[PDB]
Structures are given as C-alpha cells and as structure tokens.
Design a protein around this ligand. Structure first.
Ligand SMILES: N[C@H](S)c1cccnc1
Length: 164
C-alpha cells in the first residue's frame, strides 16, 4: 500500500538530483550515500534541519527516466571511507562536499512520459523532469512525482518513520 509512503512524504521537501551516469546512482543505491557540490550541500543541510523529511529524486542525464528516490538521514559529514564516484570530466573528488547518508524509499525507475502532467512551480512550472542538479521541487509536485513511482515492495518504511 501507499499509506506509509504518504506519511513519510507529509510536509517533506524534495530535491532533484541529476547524475552524469548510472554508476553513481548504483553506488548511491548500494552504499546509502550521496555527495554533491558545496552549493547544493549547503541547501540540503539547511533543508535537513528545516523539515521532517528531505527527499532526493535521482535522474541520470540522457536516460529519460528517474531511477528512484531516497530520504536524507543525516547532514553532510566529511572524513568517511572514500567513495569511488565516476566524476564528470573536469571534476576532481576534492571539489565535492561532504557525504549525506540516505535511506532508499524507491529503487524502481519511472519514465519521464509518466510525469509529463507534473510541473514544478520552483522552476517556472516547467515539467518536473527539467531541472539542474539540486533543483528544489515544490511540495505538491514533489509528492505526486513520488507517488507515480512503482511501489518498491523490497522496502519497509517502518524504520524510516522511526527516523523522523
Ligand atoms: N557524487 C556525484 S558523481 C555528483 C557529482 C557532481 C555533483 N553532484 C553529485
């Protein structure tokens, strides 16, 4: 069912994550972590302290889909075991901010064709699929996007609800 999902999404904030490649989303799915540029790191840390749930929705550029979404379980922290991201061409690992711990809520994909009726008021009401890495999605658009995903029956939101 979708009731616990709606509970988790209640009054959440949502951020669009655009990844250069699948390997980074797969690393994120396996390790439960994400690391972003400092400009987005600062926004996520502010948002983490401000709301009951901060949701990251991932899209690999040129894939035509979202690859799932996850909930921030910590602020960014430095000094962990280094994560072997496949960084974009001109980018080095030092340019990255700290590491966020995340809990996955949905590891299934969703094609953009399924979200074409959703527009993000925080990006000029363009379709929610359009946006730079780190673009915030307004509450209602964000919730309806997450509800479009196929249910991920591998996941139990009971532990996530304990985190809030
Ligand atoms: N860690 C991933 S590869 C990433 C790279 C650049 C910006 N944001 C996230």
């Amino acid at each position: 069912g979708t009731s616990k999902l709606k509970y988790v999404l209640q009054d959440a904030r949502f951020f669009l994550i655009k990844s250069n490649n699948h390997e980074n989303v797969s690393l994120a799915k396996a390790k439960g972590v994400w690391s972003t540029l400092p400009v987005n790191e600062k926004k996520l840390n502010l948002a983490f302290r401000s709301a009951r749930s901060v949701i990251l929705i991932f899209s690999v550029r040129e894939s035509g889909k979202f690859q799932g979404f996850a909930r921030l379980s910590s602020e960014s922290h430095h000094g962990g075991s280094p994560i072997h991201w496949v960084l974009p061409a001109g980018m080095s690992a030092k340019m990255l901010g700290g590491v966020f711990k995340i809990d996955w809520i949905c590891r299934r994909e969703l094609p953009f064709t399924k979200s074409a009726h959703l527009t993000n008021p925080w990006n000029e009401h363009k379709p929610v699929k359009i946006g730079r890495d780190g673009q915030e999605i307004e509450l209602e658009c964000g919730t309806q996007l997450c509800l479009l995903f196929p249910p991920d029956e591998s996941i139990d939101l009971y532990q996530v609800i304990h985190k809030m």
